[PDB]
Design a protein around this ligand. Sequence first.
Ligand SMILES: Nc1ncnc2c1ncn2[C@@H]1O[C@H](COP(=O)(O)OP(=O)(O)OP(=O)(O)O)[C@@H](O)[C@H]1O
Ligand SMILES: CC(C)C[C@H](N)CO
Ligand SMILES: [Mg+2]
Ligand SMILES: [Mg+2]
Ligand SMILES: [Zn+2]
Length: 865
Amino acid sequence: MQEHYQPAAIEPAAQKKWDDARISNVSEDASKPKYYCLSMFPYPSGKLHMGHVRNYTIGDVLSRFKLLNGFNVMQPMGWDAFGMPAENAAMKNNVAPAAWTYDNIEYMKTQLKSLGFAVDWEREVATCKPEYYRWEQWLFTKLFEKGIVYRKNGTVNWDPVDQTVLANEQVIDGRGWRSGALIEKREIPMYYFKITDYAEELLNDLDKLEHWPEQVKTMQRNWIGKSRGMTVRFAVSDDSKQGLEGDYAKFLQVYTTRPDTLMGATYVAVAAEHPLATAAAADKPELQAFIAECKMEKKGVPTGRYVVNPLNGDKLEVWIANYVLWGYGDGAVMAVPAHDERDFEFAAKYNLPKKQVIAVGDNAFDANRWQEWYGDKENGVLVNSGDLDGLDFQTAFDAVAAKLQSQGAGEPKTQYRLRDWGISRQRYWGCPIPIVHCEKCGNVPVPADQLPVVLPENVVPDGMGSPLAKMPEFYETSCPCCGGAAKRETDTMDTFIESSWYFFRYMSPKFSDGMVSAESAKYWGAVDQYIGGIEHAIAHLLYARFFTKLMRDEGLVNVDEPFERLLTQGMVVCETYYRENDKGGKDWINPADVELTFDDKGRPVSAVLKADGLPVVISGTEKMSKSKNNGVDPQELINAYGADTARLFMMFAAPPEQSLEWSDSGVEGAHRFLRRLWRTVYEYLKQGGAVKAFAGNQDGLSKELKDLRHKLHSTTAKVSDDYGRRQQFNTAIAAVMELLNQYDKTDTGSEQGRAVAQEVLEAAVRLLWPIVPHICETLWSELNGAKLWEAGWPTVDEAALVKSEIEVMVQVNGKLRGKITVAADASKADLEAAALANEGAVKFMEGKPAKKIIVVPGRLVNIVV
Ligand SMILES: Nc1ncnc2c1ncn2[C@@H]1O[C@H](COP(=O)(O)OP(=O)(O)OP(=O)(O)O)[C@@H](O)[C@H]1O
Ligand SMILES: CC(C)C[C@H](N)CO
Ligand SMILES: [Mg+2]
Ligand SMILES: [Mg+2]
Ligand SMILES: [Zn+2]
């Protein structure tokens, strides 16, 4: 064994050894229980950085832990290679998108292989390859036939800088998710996935996800935004039917989420476009006037027409209001000023009545001043509401529904804030949309036998709109239904399509007859463990659940939910710098290329780019990001310190969910521990070579060696709990450091000492193998001739956890009066102290003090009083 810890020697050799053994290349093996551990795959948008090291080392620790515990572990990696992240990176580096993406993939694969993650590289996928994207084109056509995918014009989110529409989940603070530019509204036709058809299932199935962070589930619940409401019909009065036709002569229909307040409605408000607006305004120019202004600030006019409250018979006047849009669904609303602030305003304004139908506790009701308990929907009971009196919100809701339905005057109605998912993009680098536009047949899907519609890879976008829209060699084609001249769709699919199903593709990435083979889907089931940032909560983590339910309903998979456990690792953060460019954007600058000037107290005041000595903007600590050019490249840390140092630092510096600020001192501290581990094994082997590890009954072992075995097996129990239940890796390392601390203070030079040292060191290197496998593999081979991954996870010897104690009898004047339990090395004075604390001795000494305390070593204490 060499004295110096030399990562450049031992890390390539350990990786070759694992690769040759094919430890990470797995099949559908029914002999071992499956474990599918997945880290969210990266965009080819730059070099990986130490934040990726944290993400992917967490996954590797969990994978290697389960591997040592006898699971069939699939841990796959691949490339989220289509769409805006890869294409924008290519354009920023003046490379064609395809050439950029494939070269960047090769660099990222080199970076990850140097880190020694236990990855099944035979399951590698690149989502920009036709072998991948043909299957999402397939699913698209299947769903398009059923109307679950559809094309429709409408108002959309337009990003003027990325020059594309965006989905609602890609608008962050009114800005595009990659550009940071303010989003505009445009009317552009788009292709949509009808995710609202699955809104109830996507909401309710969140309750299944006991092992997701509550915050992720709450964010998705609020994004879906279910509201249980009530459709309510007010019959039009017999004298207000002039001009109306059809159902609009019969009743006025409204939607409300407070049907518990229906007994308190005092008027209704109607849109300027709703038919009763027109009928009342037909002979009313002062009403056509309001209609014209309309066709915020609440303005309203009475119409003279009246409708009838179905629950109490009240006649209510219909109002035109500018706050009622002809897209409301009904285009008309009821008004309860006593319990809704908006209605309280528009009724205090126009002096419209306010009737109280809710009481919350003993709060007085002032009909002149609004209070926020008027809107309390959780702690209220109904008043002035007939047989609804005394009901709470949920009970009154169901009772109002029964009432309305008994007379056919209403029914429950659910709405959602969720809107359908707009997926088409005016961008080149993405999956082609398998649609052909025929002047005779309409928008027709490309038949399955003609998929994929292949994206040409030799395109350099000119930065002026959709490049495929300028390529008749791509879009001129024949109609698949009639054979006539037609045009391919030139919009492409958004990147989030590929990431919504890649975790199924990993199960059978070479399956050429479908998205995923039935046999492999049945074997791997769902992802047991998913690791990625909380930034994915509203987009990917919602889209992926939706796609899973789609594929299940197509009969491709048999799970309802893609990810069983989710760990959202904290962000590695570091300094950021940029310059404003002449295009109005920001050129981000790596901290390594910056020279800082400081203060008298150490404040960074100015910063310059070393290349030109010209200023840069100090932007402050922020998430390490490829797109902000602030990453620390792990390959450079590996070249200087070794991959194990990079991995150990990221696992030790904080609990995995906590933000982790970059520091060079953290790097050196991790390396010094690895030197300590190396030196500890080297010095042990130097003084006699390896021996058979202690095992079995430990009677006859010295107290110091028993204490070390207690610490050893306590440490195994703790690390096991930390990897397997708590998923906390910093405390596992600290626990092994404490074991080594005790080892250092223990004399292990004797024959039994060396046996215990071997046991300690064999356990330590296995306990740490998931975190720093290179050094642990190498040290194990110097200690022990067997294969580490065949020796398995260390076992807790419960016999080693029993404390060394003795029971001593206490007497008073010779008569035995009790029994005490003392440490095995307790002094004679500890026995005297403990014996005089025995309730038997105290009770039978009768207050008298001891005349003498006879002690027989470790057997008997005799208190003479
Ligand atoms: N600073 C970071 N700390 C921890 N995990 C990170 C960090 N940056 C990215 N990740 C994680 O790495 C995975 C891949 O993300 P991605 O490819 O978007 O990297 P990125 O640095 O965010 O790139 P980009 O800036 O182009 O979005 C995700 O699970 C993401 O949460
Ligand atoms: C699962 C994917 C949406 C992850 C992205 N490629 C990185 O944020
Ligand atoms: Mg369950
Ligand atoms: Mg990212
Ligand atoms: Zn046709």
